[PDB]
Symmetry: none
Subunit: 241 residues, 2 copies
């Protein structure tokens, strides 16, 4: 039915010691279903996790790449997944739809599994421009990808207003945005591709809200920030059953 789900952690902060305790918990956790778990972080924690994380279902990812040289070095360092187009890169650092599109194409060429992020601001949401915004973002990425490349792409839909604010989208809001993105992909690229495509939801996900969100027809997992620094991340992974 639904493609293999992904439960990605976005370690935006935390201390080396507290984090290794988490890694121990994960390593000792049996997941009785097929799900790809991803732990994304910065150089600070990347060396530790790359060596301390042993769970068969987990993989590590870099939080961003500034250029082709970094993609190359990261690849050599042994990192195969990467998160691109995350909120702040777009609104704080000014990366345009075109720029992240180029980054996504480059990463894929270098052989990475890419989690490309998209989402609208509170202003856009309220102005009723969600659908146009989201599709423009996704369209920019598509313009640079060859049909084969989609095999290496995961889309993460995160309303900018839901990230770190405590304000999660509703099962209906998420499902609608995801359904829209999938439709666009199906009609523009192919239904074969659209069906294989994982579209994750990110924006204040936690152990208590995950299942309802996951139950939606078009939600294939989550990109989790805050709750991924806590052991409740385990409940979030179990919610992708």
């Amino acid at each position: 039915s639904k493609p293999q789900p992904i439960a990605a952690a976005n370690w935006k902060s935390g201390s080396p010691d507290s984090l290794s305790e988490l890694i121990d918990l994960f390593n000792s956790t049996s997941i009785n279903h097929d799900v790809q778990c991803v732990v994304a972080s910065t150089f600070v924690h990347l060396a530790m996790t790359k060596e301390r994380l042993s769970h068969p279902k987990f993989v590590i990812a870099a939080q961003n790449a500034g250029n082709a040289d970094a993609l190359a070095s990261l690849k050599d360092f042994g990192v195969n997944w990467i998160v691109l187009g995350h909120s702040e890169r777009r609104w704080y650092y000014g990366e345009t739809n075109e720029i992240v599109a180029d980054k996504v194409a480059a990463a894929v060429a270098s052989g990475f599994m890419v989690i490309a992020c998209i989402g609208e601001t509170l202003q856009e949401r309220e102005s009723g421009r969600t659908a146009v915004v989201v599709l423009t973002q996704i369209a920019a990425i598509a313009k640079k990808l060859k049909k084969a490349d989609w095999a290496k792409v995961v889309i993460a839909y995160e309303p900018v207003w839901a990230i770190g604010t405590g304000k999660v989208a509703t099962p209906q809001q998420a499902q609608e945005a995801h359904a829209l993105i999938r439709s666009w992909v199906s009609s523009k690229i192919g239904a074969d591709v659209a069906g294989e495509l994982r579209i994750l939801y990110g924006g204040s996900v936690n152990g208590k809200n995950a299942r309802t969100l996951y139950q939606q027809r078009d939600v294939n997992g989550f990109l989790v920030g805050g709750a991924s620094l806590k052991p409740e991340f385990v409940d979030i992974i179990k919610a992708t059953q």
Copy 2:
């Protein structure tokens, strides 16, 4: 007499929780005089404050912009004020008078209210080169601004040796530098402009020293770093009466 004063906070560090407590304190504080309050920060706290800060007298600002795309995105994100040419950008990152001048011109074009920072090092101060340094910095900015643009500019004078060191300038030192900058502007651009111009003082300002500094004829407010992370920032705002 003096133009409307500005009490700007420069949140260089701090935790999300501690910071929201401050925002609550601010939001519940009545200021019985006309003053523009500004809370400047990085992407980390910018999303929270933009949503949690409700005080009618407060506005939020970005701590820097790396290029035109960032100015555009920030503008769209809903940020209208920006701090440029701050100490570290000049001495640590190597931004020249010319570069920050260009940044100031660009920001103004994009529609921002700009706090352009200037100031000399301890070496320069001691070598007795304060006046030449400060004027060269300001002159570089002027070379790129059209007379109309000055309406969107606020100048912050912060001796590099006073920032974060605990070593504040004396009411006489600040007043002299401010008087000099205003004179230059008056004779080079116009007295109309010079009079409307807010020149703030920054460099180890606190609740205890603010009033004396503010009492000077040419001091129009403060850019505060350390003390802005504490509730004494309220006393600093009251000092602009």
